[PDB]
Design a protein around this ligand. Structure first.
Ligand SMILES: [Zn+2]
Ligand SMILES: [Zn+2]
Ligand SMILES: [Zn+2]
Ligand SMILES: [Zn+2]
Lengths: 141, 140, 134, 139
């Protein structure tokens, strides 16, 4: 149940993620996704997916949330991320594009909580687990 | 230039875009770009480019700025956008990816102001001029 | 089309129309086809490829360009035709594709856009479609 | 033996094709070249290289270039193996999250992905399932 995070904080994060879905702009898939991030200063940021007529332009909820955090000055030290989506049964897991984005700013043990639309199903995995052998700045020279 | 927008607001937009470059995360290209957007109720949002080891994952300043706007619940009626980048002489222009993103939320007369790195010069173009015969929902 | 022999343009339009059969689009069901004429007067074709993650979708224009580039033609393309799944409206390239094309062609590069059947056509240069390119 | 289900000759041929595919790379911004090779069910080999753009967001990795080739050739599934090799000598080139999500759309969980360094010195074999767990895929 996510180490390094108070029960109240985790409860708050999950509430923030479900509510973030309301900010979704998805007139093409109609599939809404919400995401919340807890900073090292215990501040909560939220994001939602934003689609576009040109499908390549879609921005996921996770990336929206991270953009918000980064623009607010929080370069690192994030404590947790919660992702919630309009999936009735299965939990919403971040897509590869988002995993690559998250990997750029968090430590290997960074916790990512994935929920289904109501939170009746949940899973917790670390950044390291979701993106093994991550491609990073080390591959450049 | 830039009708329907007071000069006071345009000026404030220009400085915000200039200063937005400081929020950039570009440890790879080292090229910084700042963007500011004025909403219909005259609130200013700013954004900067965010790079990634994987070039595919980079987010331009214009898109980071629009994300800020959208996540604040302003899904329509933006009044103007100013882009400023680390370009000595020439005015930084929005790439095609960002033009397509912007086109999704603004009218054709939407003004896009492009500044040089110092903000001593500018060039104004409308969304319609920057992305003619744009791919839109009507097509879908 | 300036500088394009009519037999090349006709062949291009035909290649674009049939290219949409290579499309993988189970999400939008919107099939798009694209063909490119090399300076070599060789025709290459592409179709859109979608993905569960919309961000990963590759348009037909880009699939066609990948094909041309992987064949070793990094310059001198003569024309491009795009055939969209829009019945009564010519399909125009999205901003992402315009930026991609701009990387390899001259400002006068012609881009022909057709509706789903090819009964309607519209031509525009690269420079007209992406003014003041980045 | 190195990779299950793949003959030693085939693989050898794949590694050579991937290394050679690097010369087709268009990378004037990062200068980092990447080559990729794919073995179809039909035993045919396709190759691809990375293609960059002034707008970094528009870059297409070698893995995606090779898959576009395969798909446009009519091979919608049943791929046997994928080989990836980059300019990085001191370590193998692993696919970025973008490519993993793309590959995941067309292959089975046990699909083998071979990663090599610039020369071929180092190598590592991992399956699609290991590279992208809890994948947000078609299934
Ligand atoms: Zn995602
Ligand atoms: Zn851009
Ligand atoms: Zn496109
Ligand atoms: Zn990649």
């Amino acid at each position: 149940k996510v180490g390094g995070i108070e029960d109240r904080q985790l409860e708050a994060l999950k509430r923030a993620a479900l509510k973030a879905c309301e900010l979704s702009y998805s007139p093409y898939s109609h599939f809404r996704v919400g995401c919340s991030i807890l900073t090292n200063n215990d501040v909560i940021f939220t994001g939602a997916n934003v689609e576009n007529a040109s499908y390549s332009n879609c921005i996921c909820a996770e990336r929206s949330a991270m953009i918000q955090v980064l623009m607010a000055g929080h370069r690192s030290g994030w404590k947790c991320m919660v992702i919630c989506g309009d999936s009735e049964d299965q939990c919403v897991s971040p897509c590869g594009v988002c995993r690559q984005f998250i990997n750029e700013f968090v430590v290997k043990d960074f916790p990512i909580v994935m929920l289904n639309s109501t939170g009746s199903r949940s899973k917790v995995m670390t950044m390291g687990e979701l993106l093994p052998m991550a491609f990073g700045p080390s591959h450049l020279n």
